[PDB]
Amino acid sequence: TSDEVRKNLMDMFRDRQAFSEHTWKMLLSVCRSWAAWCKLNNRKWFPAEPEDVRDYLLYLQARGLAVKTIQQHLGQLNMLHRRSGLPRPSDSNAVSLVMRRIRKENVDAGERAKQALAFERTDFDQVRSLMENSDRCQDIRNLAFLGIAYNTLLRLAEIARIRVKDISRTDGGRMLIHIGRTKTLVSTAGVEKALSLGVTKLVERWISVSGVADDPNNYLFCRVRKNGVAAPSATSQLSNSALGGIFGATHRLIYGAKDDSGQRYLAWSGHSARVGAARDMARAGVSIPEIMQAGGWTNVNIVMNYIRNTGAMVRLLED
Amino acid sequence: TSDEVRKNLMDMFRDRQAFSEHTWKMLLSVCRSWAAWCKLNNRKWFPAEPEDVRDYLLYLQARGLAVKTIQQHLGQLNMLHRRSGLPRPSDSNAVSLVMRRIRKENVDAGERAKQALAFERTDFDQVRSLMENSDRCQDIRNLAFLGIAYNTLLRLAEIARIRVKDISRTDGGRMLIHIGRTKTLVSTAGVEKALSLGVTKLVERWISVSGVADDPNNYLFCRVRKNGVAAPSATSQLSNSALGGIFGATHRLIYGAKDDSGQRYLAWSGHSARVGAARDMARAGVSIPEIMQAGGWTNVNIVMNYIRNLDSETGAMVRLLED
Amino acid sequence: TSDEVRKNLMDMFRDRQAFSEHTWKMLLSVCRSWAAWCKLNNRKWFPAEPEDVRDYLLYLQARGLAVKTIQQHLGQLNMLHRRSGLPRPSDSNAVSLVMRRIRKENVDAGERAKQALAFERTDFDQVRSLMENSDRCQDIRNLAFLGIAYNTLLRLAEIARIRVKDISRTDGGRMLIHIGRTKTLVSTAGVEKALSLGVTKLVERWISVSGVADDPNNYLFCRVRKNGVAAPSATSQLSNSALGGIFGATHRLIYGAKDDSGQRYLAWSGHSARVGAARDMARAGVSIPEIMQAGGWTNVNIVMNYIRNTGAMVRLLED
Amino acid sequence: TSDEVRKNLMDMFRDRQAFSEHTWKMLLSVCRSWAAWCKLNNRKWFPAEPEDVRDYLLYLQARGLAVKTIQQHLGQLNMLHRRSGLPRPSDSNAVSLVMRRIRKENVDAGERAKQALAFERTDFDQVRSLMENSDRCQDIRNLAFLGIAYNTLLRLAEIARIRVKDISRTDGGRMLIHIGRTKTLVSTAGVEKALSLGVTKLVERWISVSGVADDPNNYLFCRVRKNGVAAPSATSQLSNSALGGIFGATHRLIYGAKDDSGQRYLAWSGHSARVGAARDMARAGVSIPEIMQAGGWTNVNIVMNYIRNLDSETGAMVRLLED
DNA sequence: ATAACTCTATATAATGTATGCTATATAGAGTTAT
DNA sequence: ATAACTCTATATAGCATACATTATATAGAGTTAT
DNA sequence: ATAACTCTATATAATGTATGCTATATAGAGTTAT
DNA sequence: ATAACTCTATATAGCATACATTATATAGAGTTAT
């Protein structure tokens, strides 16, 4: 009823933890937005009315947001409802159709979802060629990060979760990094990302100069202050937002300061080395089956996307 | 209800830009046929009754229609009812059954999916020969075309839609063309196809002869009248009707009038150039992904269907039996 | 009700054709059996009672039939019911559990589903080495069949459905056989099984001596009478039961007449060359992905089964 | 109802041979624990209430139990209710939720699946050395064992269950053993594993010393008492308890008493021989399928989990970074 | 003062897609025969 | 008149957006040991 | 007489696992300007 | 007495049978052109 609904919602909040803190962050961000819009037009924000949700989506469209943004607003609203034991706004032709229409109209006007600026072996080689020589702590760290990012393809959050006790050895002396939870998998088995001899060195230097190994329950990566003194912690990771500045900083280092356009992907970012490595692998002739393991994907499309725009023909009509 | 339904058809019309022009055309076409048959056979067309749709699908098969076409028919009907809030005819055991049956019955009668007749290099050379040395404007134009289609495996629309603010001039006596063979948001924005001494050149003549490059906002391909005079347009493109024309027209020149009974793909169609493009590209074995380059393919049964009759694709068993 | 039930059944019978004639054959064979058992014990055969179906299954078990036999009886009964709009006997713990128990008890006593005696390149080579020389029509045919069976892996029914107009050429002059419906697929696209140069020859000789090509709508394979005169037909195929005797005959030819045991798979049979070729491919080092296309499978288990019982270890403890 | 349910538990008992002894043991074990907790915390154990099972699973996690063990618990409870006609606790949003949460919470605390400590060749040689030259019956017996397990990657049961009407003598100063590592109907009936100069021989001594071959219906492995006298049996096999014994016992001899806190896999277990078998077989890189030969594996995450820390399996990225 | 973060909120890209029956590990308690 | 189209309609071949969440992108405001 | 099937019934092995929106093909009818 | 087990119970790792049909296996009875 309304009792049942307050119970499904409240059962949700109880095991809040069954979902990513980001799901919550986005659930509440979308609700603010919606509730905001509803207040202005004197509309009931919950349960939501298809016709009202439809005006909202068009309003987002008109605000010039990305089809993916709009779909996120719709998905959170749909989650709120479904998880409530109620009908999903998408369950109404007003909402189903306006979404298709918005997408269709936006792409039939251009719009394509972006993907981070690639970070390939060449970029790694040059950056390393340049920082290798630094005795600074921040650099030793940053170079090890970029090394692990490109070598393993792990995502910011996976990397920031690596604690000292997750590192091992192959025999040949290559560092093995064991991975627990990922965006695609939360299991006890898990993975073991192995590092090349070169990258191992890089990582070994960081461990040394930093003293993180001091507590095996310490996170591999930590802050390093203006004074160059690291700041190990077994309780607080280096912030996702920091692991990403490393990418932007490094890029600033080589290519200088970025546009004033305000666009996205003017410099490398957290996904830069995933895109870049995936690719490098294709060129090398790595097997899709293999390119996919590298990235931990269980499917073929992202992988496909990261590869796109040879000349077999011209080379065929000049006999 | 009649009100739940009325609100539902109003939603459909309000957000009609939620489907392609084409989809709507097919929906309209199917309803017109279902409706005519329902009149003829004294039944109600909306809402659709399972037994009736079953009667119609058998009527369609008896009409000697393809399994894929009987699908589109149920398909659109299923959509109409879904988008109006009524039951889908497919959600009925009678319809689910008969469709099943019909498909088995038909494949067992020789139902043959068709695909385009390859316009491969042998064909490009031969035709290149006949029209190579001709002065006729429309003859020069049609050469370029068969060049941009074979050399580029580009889709019709993307050659029609083409402008000459999309045409560069790369690597030394060679052109290059910026395009867009996508419409997927999470896809590509466009690309850049190149041209050999084969194409590129041919396209030059069409540049001299057609006078095209005067308002470079100008589509590279235009219409050539009976006088052999060409009419540019930064506002109109050659219908996809015409470009399929150049393919059949050109097949006739070499092979004559039509041929065997009203078949489907008796001559070259808008797709022939890509078909033959790949086979030639496969015959010298180039690599599938490089093959999917010229194309834009992301599936395979589409490239592999085009690849099948070749000796290169015979399979492991032949390879084993022969040492 | 009972009306609804007579309507679902009768709707079934109408589009009888949506299922294999074998499904029907087996539906009715299982029903005879059941109805038979029910009459003896004075039981209502329909709707079936879980407790009654349970006694039936044990009775089959006691009759010494194979777990697969018993499961077939259960599946047909389940189909009858489900398709009737009624509960499936398997929907009752009495039936669900007795089935597990029967399987469990039968396998915990031995029982393993068989697979036909293999027919590999060696067997093909020897048989061909021997028949090659025959100017008889039956042999020319039979050798072409065995050739196509091993080359294509097609199943009896697929082979018996090949009409003359389904054969083509690669360019290199290899025969291409286009396949419509299979046990695993009923589509208009379909397949094109290609033949080796050697097998093509074999097939070409049969076509010649037989005059099947006389009507392109003729079935590639037909009877050949004691007098050696073939008997082409565009309406009647060579019987599945005949296409299989070819396998048993050929085996009788080389190894003589079979046991008196009454077992199954004493000689080659319709599936002999599928099993055999799959294997030959493994040995050659063919890629599973490829071994699977050969057989038209969309999965990996049958394929796996056809390969089983090297010595990497002994070869590892003799350093 | 209480009658629908009574009929349902009667069905369970009547066809109890529909599950393994083991499954029943686990079911019984789980209910005993769920029942005790329900008493303690004043709740009803049958039928299970969602909130209560939710309370119990949190109790189990707080018990510092593994995610895989909390699963078995819900799992058996889910089965009980399914086989009695009641709702499954998993079919509840509360239970579906908390289980989800617990798994994320635990993996994020370092939940580490465990696997066996490899008993590889270095270990077989070293131990071979220590016990090589010993006269002790039980010492000779334990050598053979570690031989049949490493050389054959055979399961415990299949070495216990083994007879000596299953043991041949192939290729010249080598033995061969017929077995059965399947139980799948649509699977294998059995196989034949061979032995090197390593094993085979060792097994000989156990043949001389143990006096085994007197009633060849005789299991190859028997018990060796404090007097060092061996007791054959064509009727009893060495418990799987004992064979895991020889593994730990033998790890202690080399490495001493137990070690670090009550962990799980601190010493060698019944699985160690297969683990190390594969790694050694992978280290000289043999081929996965040939690897799955010695084993019987049909999955991989089981072989590959055993393969992971090796340099051979490092992956494409390392291979690229290093030229 | 400030470098180097943290946090936090809106914006937008990226991805799998699921169990349940049966074995083993293991520490203890129970049993034989030495 | 017709070549040379464009529009149409019905026929069929060739693709690719809708779930449910979980994650990253980025600018800007707040925090802390130097 | 009979070889070589067909048929038919019981027995038992073998296998995928699914659409719906959007483009093209095509023959005709309609339109311009030559 | 204890070595050497076997039994147990609770803990966890490693697998693999339940749908819905569609097909082949095989002996034996009936069919037909020679």
PDB file of N, CA, C and O in Angstrom, chain D residues 27 82 98 109 139 147 158 161 175 214 219 228 234 243 265 278 308:
ATOM      1  N   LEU D  27      22.843 -30.684   4.918  1.00  0.00           N
ATOM      2  CA  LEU D  27      21.500 -30.208   5.237  1.00  0.00           C
ATOM      3  C   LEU D  27      21.231 -30.341   6.723  1.00  0.00           C
ATOM      4  O   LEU D  27      20.794 -29.382   7.355  1.00  0.00           O
ATOM      5  N   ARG D  82      12.071 -25.356  -0.257  1.00  0.00           N
ATOM      6  CA  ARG D  82      11.667 -25.680  -1.620  1.00  0.00           C
ATOM      7  C   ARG D  82      11.090 -27.095  -1.627  1.00  0.00           C
ATOM      8  O   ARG D  82      10.020 -27.342  -2.163  1.00  0.00           O
ATOM      9  N   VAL D  98      20.763  -8.480   2.105  1.00  0.00           N
ATOM     10  CA  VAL D  98      21.819  -8.773   3.068  1.00  0.00           C
ATOM     11  C   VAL D  98      22.920  -9.711   2.546  1.00  0.00           C
ATOM     12  O   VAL D  98      24.112  -9.476   2.778  1.00  0.00           O
ATOM     13  N   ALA D 109      37.300  -7.009   2.951  1.00  0.00           N
ATOM     14  CA  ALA D 109      37.894  -7.107   4.273  1.00  0.00           C
ATOM     15  C   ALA D 109      39.051  -8.056   4.090  1.00  0.00           C
ATOM     16  O   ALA D 109      39.823  -8.322   5.007  1.00  0.00           O
ATOM     17  N   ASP D 139      56.635 -46.226   5.956  1.00  0.00           N
ATOM     18  CA  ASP D 139      57.386 -45.215   5.240  1.00  0.00           C
ATOM     19  C   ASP D 139      57.421 -45.565   3.756  1.00  0.00           C
ATOM     20  O   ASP D 139      57.336 -44.687   2.884  1.00  0.00           O
ATOM     21  N   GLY D 147      53.362 -41.003  -4.699  1.00  0.00           N
ATOM     22  CA  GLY D 147      53.712 -41.314  -6.080  1.00  0.00           C
ATOM     23  C   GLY D 147      52.454 -41.435  -6.943  1.00  0.00           C
ATOM     24  O   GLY D 147      52.352 -40.815  -7.993  1.00  0.00           O
ATOM     25  N   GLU D 158      39.565 -42.333  -5.386  1.00  0.00           N
ATOM     26  CA  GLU D 158      39.974 -43.215  -6.469  1.00  0.00           C
ATOM     27  C   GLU D 158      41.281 -43.964  -6.228  1.00  0.00           C
ATOM     28  O   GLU D 158      41.644 -44.827  -7.016  1.00  0.00           O
ATOM     29  N   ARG D 161      39.635 -46.401  -3.030  1.00  0.00           N
ATOM     30  CA  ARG D 161      38.752 -47.340  -3.720  1.00  0.00           C
ATOM     31  C   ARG D 161      39.526 -48.321  -4.604  1.00  0.00           C
ATOM     32  O   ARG D 161      39.005 -49.369  -4.992  1.00  0.00           O
ATOM     33  N   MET D 175      54.118 -49.715 -14.602  1.00  0.00           N
ATOM     34  CA  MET D 175      52.804 -50.262 -14.314  1.00  0.00           C
ATOM     35  C   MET D 175      51.782 -49.392 -15.037  1.00  0.00           C
ATOM     36  O   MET D 175      52.141 -48.398 -15.672  1.00  0.00           O
ATOM     37  N   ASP D 214      47.808 -60.936  -2.108  1.00  0.00           N
ATOM     38  CA  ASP D 214      47.562 -62.322  -1.725  1.00  0.00           C
ATOM     39  C   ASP D 214      46.148 -62.767  -2.068  1.00  0.00           C
ATOM     40  O   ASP D 214      45.926 -63.921  -2.435  1.00  0.00           O
ATOM     41  N   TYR D 219      42.642 -54.167  -2.235  1.00  0.00           N
ATOM     42  CA  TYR D 219      42.910 -52.746  -2.386  1.00  0.00           C
ATOM     43  C   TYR D 219      44.421 -52.565  -2.222  1.00  0.00           C
ATOM     44  O   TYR D 219      45.021 -53.116  -1.299  1.00  0.00           O
ATOM     45  N   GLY D 228      54.165 -51.968  12.592  1.00  0.00           N
ATOM     46  CA  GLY D 228      54.652 -51.849  11.226  1.00  0.00           C
ATOM     47  C   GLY D 228      54.156 -53.025  10.410  1.00  0.00           C
ATOM     48  O   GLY D 228      54.752 -53.373   9.403  1.00  0.00           O
ATOM     49  N   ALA D 234      39.868 -56.541   1.083  1.00  0.00           N
ATOM     50  CA  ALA D 234      39.184 -56.445  -0.192  1.00  0.00           C
ATOM     51  C   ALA D 234      37.818 -55.913   0.208  1.00  0.00           C
ATOM     52  O   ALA D 234      36.896 -55.844  -0.598  1.00  0.00           O
ATOM     53  N   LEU D 243      44.441 -40.614   4.228  1.00  0.00           N
ATOM     54  CA  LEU D 243      45.208 -40.161   3.058  1.00  0.00           C
ATOM     55  C   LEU D 243      45.541 -38.675   3.110  1.00  0.00           C
ATOM     56  O   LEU D 243      46.551 -38.250   2.555  1.00  0.00           O
ATOM     57  N   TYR D 265      44.954 -24.994   5.150  1.00  0.00           N
ATOM     58  CA  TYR D 265      45.997 -25.223   4.138  1.00  0.00           C
ATOM     59  C   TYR D 265      47.359 -24.699   4.576  1.00  0.00           C
ATOM     60  O   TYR D 265      48.067 -24.062   3.793  1.00  0.00           O
ATOM     61  N   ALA D 278      50.143 -30.149 -11.923  1.00  0.00           N
ATOM     62  CA  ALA D 278      49.818 -29.244 -13.015  1.00  0.00           C
ATOM     63  C   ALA D 278      50.836 -28.126 -13.222  1.00  0.00           C
ATOM     64  O   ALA D 278      51.211 -27.839 -14.356  1.00  0.00           O
ATOM     65  N   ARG D 308      47.932 -19.587 -12.080  1.00  0.00           N
ATOM     66  CA  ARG D 308      48.196 -18.158 -11.946  1.00  0.00           C
ATOM     67  C   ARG D 308      49.489 -17.441 -11.500  1.00  0.00           C
ATOM     68  O   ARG D 308      49.846 -16.418 -12.086  1.00  0.00           O
TER      69      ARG D 308
END
